[PDB]
Amino acid sequence: QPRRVSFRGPGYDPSRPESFFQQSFQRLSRLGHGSYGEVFKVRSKEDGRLYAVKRSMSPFRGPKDRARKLAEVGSHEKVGQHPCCVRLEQAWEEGGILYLQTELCGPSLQQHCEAWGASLPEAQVWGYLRDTLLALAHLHSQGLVHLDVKPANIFLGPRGRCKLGDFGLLVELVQEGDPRYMAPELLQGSYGTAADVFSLGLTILEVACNMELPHGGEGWQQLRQGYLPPEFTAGLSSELRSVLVMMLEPDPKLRATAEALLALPVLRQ
Ligand SMILES: Cc1ccc(O)cc1-c1c(N)c(=O)[nH]c2cc(Cl)cnc12
Numbered sequence: 001q002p003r004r005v006s007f008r009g010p011g012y013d014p015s016r017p018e019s020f021f022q023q024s025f026q027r028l029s030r031l032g033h034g035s036y037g038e039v040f041k042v043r044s045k046e047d048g049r050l051y052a053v054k055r056s057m058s059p060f061r062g063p064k065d066r067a068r069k070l071a072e073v074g075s076h077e078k079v080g081q082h083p084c085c086v087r088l089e090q091a092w093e094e095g096g097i098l099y100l101q102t103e104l105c106g107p108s109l110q111q112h113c114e115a116w117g118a119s120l121p122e123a124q125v126w127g128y129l130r131d132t133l134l135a136l137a138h139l140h141s142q143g144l145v146h147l148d149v150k151p152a153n154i155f156l157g158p159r160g161r162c163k164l165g166d167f168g169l170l171v172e173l174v175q176e177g178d179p180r181y182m183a184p185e186l187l188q189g190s191y192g193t194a195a196d197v198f199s200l201g202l203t204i205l206e207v208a209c210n211m212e213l214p215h216g217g218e219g220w221q222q223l224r225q226g227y228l229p230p231e232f233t234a235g236l237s238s239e240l241r242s243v244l245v246m247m248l249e250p251d252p253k254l255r256a257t258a259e260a261l262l263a264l265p266v267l268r269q
C-alpha cells in the first residue's frame with residue numbers, strides 16, 4: 001500500500017494490483033530519466049490538474065538507502081512555499097519506490113539554452129539571475145544550503161520566470177556535487193551559504209556566454225581565482241561582468257551574499 005512520506009509531525013482502489021501511481025495518474029510523457037529514476041508529466045485522475053512526478057528506479061536496498069531518498073522530501077519541506085521554488089505537493093512510498101509529486105514547470109534552464117544554441121539575451125539572463133537569487137535568499141535565510149545550483153536544476157515559469165528545484169542535496173547548516181559548478185572552498189571540506197552564490201555565478205556565466213564549464217584541469221582552476229576567460233566573457237556588459245566577478249569571489253569570507261546582490265541597482269528590479 002502507499003505510505004505518505006512527510007516530516008511535518010477516492011480513485012485509489014487497493015483491491016486490484018496496479019500501483020497507486022498507475023491508478024491515480026495519467027502518464028502524459030517522460031520529462032527525464034537517469035540512475036535516480038524517472039520523471040513524468042502526469043494528469044491527475046482526481047482533479048484533472050497537471051503535475052510532474054519523480055519516482056526512484058529500484059526498491060530500497062536498506063534503511064540507509066531509504067533514509068537517503070526520503071531526506072529529499074524533508075529537505076523539500078524545510079524550504080516551504082516560495083514563488084521561486086518548485087512547490088512539492090505530496091510524496092509517498094510503495095513497493096520500496098519513492099514518489100514525489102510537484103507542480104508542473106517548464107523546461108530546465110539547461111534545456112532552454114540548448115534549444116537556442118546561443119547565449120541567452122542579457123535581459124532574459126537578468127531575470128533568471130534575480131529569480132534564482134530570490135530563491136537562494138529564501139533558502140539561506142533559513143540556514144539551508146542547496147549545494148547543487150546548476151542550469152539543470154532551474155526550471156522555467158511562465159512569462160520569463162524560473163524556479164529553483166531538486167533539493168536532494170540540500171543541507172541544514174553531504175553527497176558528491178557537480179564539480180563544474182563547485183565552489184573552491186568545498187575542496188577543503190568547507191561549506192556554507194556562500195557556496196550556492198558561486199555555483200549560481202558559474203551557472204550565469206555558462207548560460208550568458210554559452211561556454212561549457214570544465215570538469216577539472218587548469219581551466220577549472222582559473223575560474224576559482226578572480227580570472228574570467230576573456231575569450232568568452234567579451235560580450236558581457238559592464239553591469240553583468242561586475243555582478244559575476246562578485247559572485248565568483250574565491251574567498252567565501254569576501255563573497256557577496258544573495259541578499260547583498262539583490263540590493264544592487266541592477267537587481268533591485
Ligand atoms: C518532479 C520533480 C521533483 C522534485 C523537483 O525538485 C523537481 C521536479 C521536476 C519538476 N517539478 C518539473 O516540472 N520538471 C522536472 C523535470 C525533470 Cl527532468 C526533473 N524534475 C522535474
Ligand SMILES: [Cl-]
Nearest residue numbers: 216217218220
Ligand atoms: Cl583539477
